[PDB]
Each structure stands twice: as C-alpha cells, then as structure tokens.
Design a protein around this motif. Sequence first.
Motif, PDB file in Angstrom:
ATOM      1  N   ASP A  43      -8.440  17.354  24.775  1.00  0.00           N
ATOM      2  CA  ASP A  43      -7.051  17.790  24.679  1.00  0.00           C
ATOM      3  C   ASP A  43      -6.162  16.669  24.154  1.00  0.00           C
ATOM      4  N   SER A  44      -5.833  15.717  25.031  1.00  0.00           N
ATOM      5  CA  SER A  44      -5.016  14.582  24.617  1.00  0.00           C
ATOM      6  C   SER A  44      -5.754  13.695  23.624  1.00  0.00           C
ATOM      7  N   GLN A  45      -7.083  13.624  23.727  1.00  0.00           N
ATOM      8  CA  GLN A  45      -7.859  12.834  22.777  1.00  0.00           C
ATOM      9  C   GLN A  45      -7.725  13.386  21.364  1.00  0.00           C
ATOM     10  N   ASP A  46      -7.772  14.712  21.218  1.00  0.00           N
ATOM     11  CA  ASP A  46      -7.612  15.320  19.900  1.00  0.00           C
ATOM     12  C   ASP A  46      -6.229  15.038  19.330  1.00  0.00           C
ATOM     13  N   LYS A  47      -5.200  15.060  20.181  1.00  0.00           N
ATOM     14  CA  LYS A  47      -3.857  14.717  19.725  1.00  0.00           C
ATOM     15  C   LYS A  47      -3.793  13.273  19.247  1.00  0.00           C
ATOM     16  N   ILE A  48      -4.510  12.374  19.924  1.00  0.00           N
ATOM     17  CA  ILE A  48      -4.574  10.984  19.482  1.00  0.00           C
ATOM     18  C   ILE A  48      -5.241  10.890  18.115  1.00  0.00           C
ATOM     19  N   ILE A  49      -6.332  11.635  17.917  1.00  0.00           N
ATOM     20  CA  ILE A  49      -7.050  11.597  16.644  1.00  0.00           C
ATOM     21  C   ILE A  49      -6.129  12.006  15.502  1.00  0.00           C
ATOM     22  N   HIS A  50      -5.364  13.082  15.702  1.00  0.00           N
ATOM     23  CA  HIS A  50      -4.411  13.512  14.685  1.00  0.00           C
ATOM     24  C   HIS A  50      -3.335  12.460  14.453  1.00  0.00           C
ATOM     25  N   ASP A  51      -3.011  11.670  15.479  1.00  0.00           N
ATOM     26  CA  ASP A  51      -2.020  10.612  15.320  1.00  0.00           C
ATOM     27  C   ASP A  51      -2.573   9.445  14.510  1.00  0.00           C
ATOM     28  N   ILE A  52      -3.832   9.069  14.753  1.00  0.00           N
ATOM     29  CA  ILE A  52      -4.404   7.902  14.084  1.00  0.00           C
ATOM     30  C   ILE A  52      -4.506   8.142  12.584  1.00  0.00           C
ATOM     31  N   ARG A  53      -4.889   9.358  12.186  1.00  0.00           N
ATOM     32  CA  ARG A  53      -5.036   9.663  10.767  1.00  0.00           C
ATOM     33  C   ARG A  53      -3.716   9.500  10.025  1.00  0.00           C
ATOM     34  N   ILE A  54      -2.617   9.973  10.616  1.00  0.00           N
ATOM     35  CA  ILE A  54      -1.311   9.804   9.986  1.00  0.00           C
ATOM     36  C   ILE A  54      -0.966   8.327   9.865  1.00  0.00           C
ATOM     37  N   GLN A  55      -1.229   7.554  10.919  1.00  0.00           N
ATOM     38  CA  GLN A  55      -0.869   6.141  10.904  1.00  0.00           C
ATOM     39  C   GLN A  55      -1.757   5.349   9.951  1.00  0.00           C
ATOM     40  N   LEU A  56      -3.071   5.581  10.000  1.00  0.00           N
ATOM     41  CA  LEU A  56      -3.975   4.838   9.128  1.00  0.00           C
ATOM     42  C   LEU A  56      -3.772   5.204   7.664  1.00  0.00           C
ATOM     43  N   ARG A  57      -3.440   6.465   7.373  1.00  0.00           N
ATOM     44  CA  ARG A  57      -3.010   6.806   6.021  1.00  0.00           C
ATOM     45  C   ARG A  57      -1.763   6.022   5.644  1.00  0.00           C
ATOM     46  N   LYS A  58      -0.815   5.907   6.577  1.00  0.00           N
ATOM     47  CA  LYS A  58       0.361   5.082   6.340  1.00  0.00           C
ATOM     48  C   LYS A  58      -0.002   3.603   6.290  1.00  0.00           C
ATOM     49  N   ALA A  59      -0.880   3.153   7.192  1.00  0.00           N
ATOM     50  CA  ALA A  59      -1.170   1.726   7.302  1.00  0.00           C
ATOM     51  C   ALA A  59      -1.789   1.180   6.021  1.00  0.00           C
ATOM     52  N   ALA A  60      -2.726   1.920   5.429  1.00  0.00           N
ATOM     53  CA  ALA A  60      -3.363   1.458   4.203  1.00  0.00           C
ATOM     54  C   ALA A  60      -2.466   1.616   2.984  1.00  0.00           C
ATOM     55  N   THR A  61      -1.366   2.363   3.102  1.00  0.00           N
ATOM     56  CA  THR A  61      -0.546   2.654   1.931  1.00  0.00           C
ATOM     57  C   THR A  61       0.245   1.429   1.481  1.00  0.00           C
ATOM     58  N   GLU A  62       1.157   0.936   2.328  1.00  0.00           N
ATOM     59  CA  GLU A  62       2.033  -0.147   1.886  1.00  0.00           C
ATOM     60  C   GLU A  62       1.279  -1.466   1.784  1.00  0.00           C
ATOM     61  N   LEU A  63       0.304  -1.688   2.667  1.00  0.00           N
ATOM     62  CA  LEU A  63      -0.454  -2.934   2.627  1.00  0.00           C
ATOM     63  C   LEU A  63      -1.190  -3.082   1.300  1.00  0.00           C
ATOM     64  N   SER A  64      -1.778  -1.993   0.802  1.00  0.00           N
ATOM     65  CA  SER A  64      -2.290  -1.999  -0.562  1.00  0.00           C
ATOM     66  C   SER A  64      -1.155  -1.987  -1.579  1.00  0.00           C
ATOM     67  N   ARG A  65      -0.063  -1.283  -1.274  1.00  0.00           N
ATOM     68  CA  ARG A  65       1.094  -1.253  -2.162  1.00  0.00           C
ATOM     69  C   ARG A  65       1.758  -2.617  -2.284  1.00  0.00           C
ATOM     70  N   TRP A  66       1.621  -3.472  -1.271  1.00  0.00           N
ATOM     71  CA  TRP A  66       2.189  -4.810  -1.298  1.00  0.00           C
ATOM     72  C   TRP A  66       1.166  -5.868  -1.674  1.00  0.00           C
ATOM     73  N   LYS A  67      -0.010  -5.450  -2.140  1.00  0.00           N
ATOM     74  CA  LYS A  67      -0.972  -6.347  -2.775  1.00  0.00           C
ATOM     75  C   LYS A  67      -1.436  -7.461  -1.839  1.00  0.00           C
ATOM     76  N   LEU A  68      -1.738  -7.101  -0.596  1.00  0.00           N
ATOM     77  CA  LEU A  68      -2.526  -7.946   0.293  1.00  0.00           C
ATOM     78  C   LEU A  68      -3.723  -7.128   0.747  1.00  0.00           C
ATOM     79  N   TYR A  69      -4.920  -7.670   0.549  1.00  0.00           N
ATOM     80  CA  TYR A  69      -6.151  -6.922   0.756  1.00  0.00           C
ATOM     81  C   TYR A  69      -6.898  -7.336   2.014  1.00  0.00           C
TER      82      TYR A  69
END
Lengths: 560, 213, 35, 111
Positions: free
Chosen positions: A1-27
């Motif tokens: 229940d709550s674990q599935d909600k966490i999983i849906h949260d991580i995907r949004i954040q990790l999609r966000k997390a990899a976006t600007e960090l690659s967008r700001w050219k630090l690998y």
Amino acid sequence: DSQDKIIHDIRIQLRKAATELSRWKLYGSSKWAAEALAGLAEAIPQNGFGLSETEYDLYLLGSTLFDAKEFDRCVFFLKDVTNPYLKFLKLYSKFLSWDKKSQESMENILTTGKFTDQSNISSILKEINTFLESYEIKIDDDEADLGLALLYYLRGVILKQEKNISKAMSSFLKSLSCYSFNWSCWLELMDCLQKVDDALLLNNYLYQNFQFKFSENLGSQRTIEFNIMIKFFKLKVFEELNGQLEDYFEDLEFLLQVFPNFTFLKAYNATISYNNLDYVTAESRFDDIVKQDPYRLNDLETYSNILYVMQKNSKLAYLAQFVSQIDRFRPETCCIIANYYSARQEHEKSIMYFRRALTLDKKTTNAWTLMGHEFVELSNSHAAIECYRRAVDICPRDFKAWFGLGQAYALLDMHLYSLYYFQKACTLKPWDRRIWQVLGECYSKTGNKVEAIKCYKRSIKASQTVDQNTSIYYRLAQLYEELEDLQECKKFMMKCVDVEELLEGIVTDETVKARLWLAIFEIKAGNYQLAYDYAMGVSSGTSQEIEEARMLARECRRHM
Amino acid sequence: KEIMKNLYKINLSKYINTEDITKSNEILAKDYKLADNVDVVRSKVDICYTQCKFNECLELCETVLENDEFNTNILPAYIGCLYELSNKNKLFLLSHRLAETFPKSAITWFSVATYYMSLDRISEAQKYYSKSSILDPSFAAAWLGFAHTYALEGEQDQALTAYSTASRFFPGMHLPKLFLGMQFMAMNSLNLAESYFVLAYDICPNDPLVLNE
Amino acid sequence: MIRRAPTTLQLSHDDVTSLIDDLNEQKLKQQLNIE
Amino acid sequence: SSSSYRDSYFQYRHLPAPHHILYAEWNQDILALPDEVANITMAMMTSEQNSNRYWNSFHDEDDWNLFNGMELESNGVVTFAGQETITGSIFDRRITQLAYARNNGWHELAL
C-alpha cells in the motif's frame, strides 16, 4: 500500500534528479541517477528553468562548449552572466579546466600528496563567496532553488582540495539539505570522513538537527526515515570504513525490496560477502552481474581478484580477453589483466600493467601493494620495499600496505627490523587473527618466548572458528616446552588433539606430531593404556609417523 | 493433426522451399504456446546457418544456450557459427566448459579442434579431429574437418582418399562428393571432376556451391 | 560441418602477357601512320 | 576552416581524458592467448607441445590409455598401440570396444 505510493514517488524524483544534473553537465551523479531509476522495481517530459530568452541563448553556447573540452572558451563568453544557474556553470568550467590541466601536468608523478602531511584555486573560491553574498536568498530559506544548492556543492569540493576540512563538510550538508539525490555530493562527503567515530558524530547530526527543504523536494520524501540517500549513506560509509554497524540491517533489506534490479546494489552486496572472506557465495553473487550486465568496469576489479584465489585460470583468461576488448584506458581493465598475467607466473609482464593501472587514475592506491607482491616473487627485495612504502605514504591507514611491507623484511633474515612494521599494522586492525599470529612468529624467531605466549593467546580469541586454532595450538605448546614446564603444555596438547575429534577425524599433519609427542610423554607417566589409543589414532600419517607410533604401540601393548 | 504436422515439419531438411518452413514455424510460434522452444529456435538457427545469416545465428544460439548451456542438438551449428565469426575468446570458453564436463563426448573434442583450427593449427588440429571421429562414428563434422585439415596444407595425394572415405561411409550427402570433385579440379583433372559434380547436383539440385563449381 | 572457400580464379599470366603484347602492337603501329 | 565541427568519427572529445593520447600504444598490444603460450615462459614446437598436453589433461585413465599412441590414417584405417597392435577400420563400433577390452581386460596364456 504505502510502499507502492513510495515507488511512484521515487520514479518522479529520479526522473527529475537525472534531468538537471545531466542538464548542468556534471556526470558524477547523472550517471548514477539513471542507474537507480533503471533498477527500480516495476509497479509527458518534466522540465523547468527560470531563464530569460536573452540569457538562455548563452546557455546553449555554454553547455555545448562544455562537453567539447573547451572549458576555457566557455568561461570567456559566460563571464558577465548574473543568474546563479549560469554562475555555477562558469565556475564549474573554470574548476574542471584546472582539474583537467593538473592531470596533464603530472603523469610521471605516481605518488600524490604533500610530504608535510592554492592561489589560483583561491580565485574560484572568492568568486563563490562574492556572488553568494550579493544574491538575495543565501540559503536557510524555504524558497531555495536547485542552483543555489548546486552552487554550494562546488564550494564544498573546492574547499576540500585546499584541505580546509570541517568547512566543506558544513557546505555539503547545506547543499544536501536543500537538494538530496546528488550522488556525487555524497561521495565527496564520504571522502572527507576519516575514522569511524567521526561517522557516528556525522550520523547523529543527520538525525536530530538535519531536515530537508520540503519546498524543493517532493512530498513524502523529505522525511529522513523514508529517504533513500540517507539509506545509501548507511551502506557506503559503514562498510567501506568497516565501522560498527547500526541501523544497517533493516535498511539493507529495505533497499533490496525497492531496488531489485539495481546493478550497483548487488555488486556492493557481493562485495560485502567478499569483505567477510566468504568467496564461494561471493562468486554466485557476482555471476549474476556478468550475465545481467556484461559491460561494467566498475567493480570487476574484485571479480578478477576472486578468480585469482579460486585458481579458475580458464575463467580468468576469458575475463582478461573480454575486458581488454572493451577499452584499455580504464583503471580497472588494466588491473583485471594484471591478475590474469600474475596467475601464469609471468611477473615481469604483470608488474608492468599494475604500474599502468595506477598511472591512469592515481586514486587507486590498492594497486601499490599488488605491485609490491610481484617484485617479491621476482626475488627482487630492494624494489619491493619502495613499492610498499609509497602505499603507506599515500595514506598511513593502510593495513594491506603495512603487512605487505612487514613480510618483505621477514622473508630476509632481518626479523627484528620487521617487528616495528608489524607493530604498526596491529593498531590498524587489532581484531584480526592473521596479524596476531605473524607477530608471534617474529617474537619466536627473536628469542622473546615470554612475549610470544601472550601474542598467540590473543590470536586464539580473535579467531572466529575453532578449526583455525589447530596450527596455533601445536606451536604454542612447543614454546612451553622451550620454557621447561611440561605440565603446562599438556593442556594445549589436549586441545589440539581434541580438534581432530571435533572435526570428524581431520587427521592433519600438525596433529600427527601432537599425538606422537603426547604418547611419548604418557609412557614416562606410566599410563600405558591411556597412551595406546593415541598411537592407533595417528596410524594414518607420514611414513615416519606411522612407524614411530607402531613401535610405541607394541611397547605399551606389552606392558598393558 | 496440424500441430504435429508443424512439429515434424520443423525438423525437415533445408535447401527446398524454406519459405514453407518459415510460414509453418511462424504459425506454430504465436498460435500455440510453443513460441521460443528448443527445436523451433534450432530450426531458425539451421535456416540462418544455411543462408549464412550469422548475426541472427549467434543471437538465437546465445538466447537459447543462456537457458541450456550443454544442449547437444545445437552445439555443432553454434561451433560452426563461432568459427565463421572467429570469436576466439567465446570459443575458448566453450571448449574449456565442455572439457571440464563432457570429456567422453566427441562434441567437446570437436570444439577444441576447431579452437585450434581458428588459430591456424591445422597440423595439430588433425589429431583432435581424429580423436573426435574415433570417440563417435557417423559424425559428418569431425571427418569432414579432418579431410579439410588434410587438403588445406600440402599433402594433396591422400586428401583424395580421405574424401573418398567421407563419400563412401557417409552416403546421401552432396558435400563430400562436391569436395572430392573440387579436389580433382585442384589436381587439374577435369572429366572426373565433372562426373562427381553432376553426381552432386543429382544429389542436391538447389545449392549455390555445386552450381558455382 | 564447415565449407571452405569456393574455387575462384583470377587473371593468369598468359592472358595478361598476351594483352601486353597486343597493347604493344597497337602502340607500335599507329606512330608509323603518324610518321 | 572547419575541423572540430564534424562528428563523424572518433575524435579527441569522445575519450574521457584528452591526455590519454600521450600513451596511445596500449591498443596495439596482443594479449597472450590463454593456454599454450604459458610454456614460452618456462622455455625462457615446444609451445604447441604444451598446448597438446594442456588440452590432453582432460582425459579419463582408460580413455587416455586408448589415445596414448593412437594414429589415424587418411583412408580411415586406425592403428592402436598397446603398452600387440589393433589395426582395423574405424567407423565400425566393435573395434573400439575390442581395443578397450584388450587395454583394461585381463588376458592370461596360462602355460
């Protein structure tokens, strides 16, 4: 229940997390961020930046000139920009221009550091402080953007390279508080830690008086108990420093549930078994990595390390040919081959690759000790001594380097001269059976039998399994015989023989001499019956062992 | 009826109306649950090997061997595919893995011999082809490779005898007859070569090799 | 079972030498017309 | 002109560190092949002999004994060496079993 909600949260954040960090050219974190998302358990693009169209044109020029290795030209065009998002990019371009430039300057320089253990660097640091004061947030506010958090990361890393520790730590924590999920930020934070007791102090700070900016981070994530980076910190620092474990078990199985296909986790999980001298299970864990991810020159250095001990030369020969085909410029691929070349008793060639593996990345100090070993097998003790000695001068807290340097003197007759090196290695890892036993040999060979008794006794307690005490017991008993107290050595003689019975009749060599000596003394004691069974139990040894007991058996049989 | 017709049709020989076999295995794949079974992919590998589609050959062989590492039905085709691709390192892995596990079976020694063959070791690989042939008779691969070791470097006189043994002891294949005719061409004898080649064409009507020769 | 390289033949020496000789004929006879 | 604007081949920015070109010789190193070239170290015709021995170690006792002096002739006639001779045509299944029999079996003239 709550674990599935966490999983849906991580995907949004990790999609966000990899976006600007690659967008700001630090690998450093961008590569890791996508890895975490790929291995995440199965259950419109997102982008946004407060940039004006006039200044946004400069970003395309700045970003494309960055990865084209022309860092200096990026600085000149991006000089007059005032936006914090771009201000970080200019100074990041300047820093990487210097960090790159330092690498070309020294390539013949193998050892890195200063013997006692700036001005151009301080120019970057002043610009950070000057811009930080002028800007109208200066952290500690709810409305704190990613860039200002990212800017603090550069301030922390530029401070550490000046050796201004305990101020870069505070800077990283401020950057991490405003923005978590920056893996490269954590690694620099982990590097500045030096001892386990510091980790406990740092671990507490992350719990009582540490909170994230709930505005920037998504909901149900800012909580420390349900975060992921705080967890990943636990598995990293607690085991790489081999520190005392706490809040580590329940977190590890929690990460395996959320991340079942994460390549980094399994290899770290495999390394844990490797670090505990459990090689057979380590092989099974690693075999999944190669099948699932065949191209990963990150943790294979331990894989080719395991295979050398396994003596699976065919499997290792496959890896050397396969790894070398990818590329020969990584630090690991020049260490994978060296192990394969060492197994074939070709040392003059294996010694070359270890020096090669170190030149590509000077941070890999583990190759110094291995480079030293290949000299000792070459019967060249003079060259080995320098090779080991460099390793400890890079970092004095190297148990491998001290021990490898201690042995090289022990191979020569200079037994006492090696006592200091072994003594120094004792303080690094006191809770090890291997180091303590060697000290006993050094004391035994230098005529210090009074001290050697206490040395072996300490080693016995440190041993995790009773089986491993068979070798120590027999030698420990000999020293008592050298001290001329035959009654005292009997108790240790009982234990070494009794381990044979506890091991369903191991019948090893160093218990054969035990039974023969025990039977001989029992004849002098007049107890022939108690000595007869000792001779028969040892009737499966060497050619001289059996006849010694056979004649003793006849003698006690007649008087029986 | 239809499923067993398709299943038997999987195993039929190639060189004749292969498109029918493609249609049949395509029907068997999606309609029934036998979509990626051992023999359907074995037939796909055989089709690719006959048509020299070696990339798909290696891909299919790998995705099947990842499941069964010692499936003797596909190993000859897999080894031939690796020899053609000259993947020395994969071939050495397979040779060691089968040497540690199946020393008696001739597949292992055929693999070791072809590992030597890929390294230009014809003189030595002759012995291992002989070993593979002895450990298992009625194996076309071993004896044909032995005759190839004979014909490749010098000693042309008894390559004829080796190919004659291949033809006599293995009747019904056009390949030994074609090879014997090719060798008769190599010695510059013409009428006998033409006779053997017309025999081979009689045996196999649809094969680029025989018509080219 | 493995197939070797199929038989292919290239330019021999006799035919190329014959073409050399004919080529000399045609670069030898035309200058007589010119002269 | 225009040099760095084309990206149709491996260039100086595709590799991570531009200064790796200083070495630029590790690519042209033939790695020693797994098994036979281990003998050239001991020697410092022989290397191929060690390859034969290395790959020959994977035998059973009786199987190796069968193949100790085995020689296969081109026409298919095989000669087997007893440590008598077992000259016969191969591809018949009985001959190999007969070699096995006279190899491991017990034969006694008994006067």
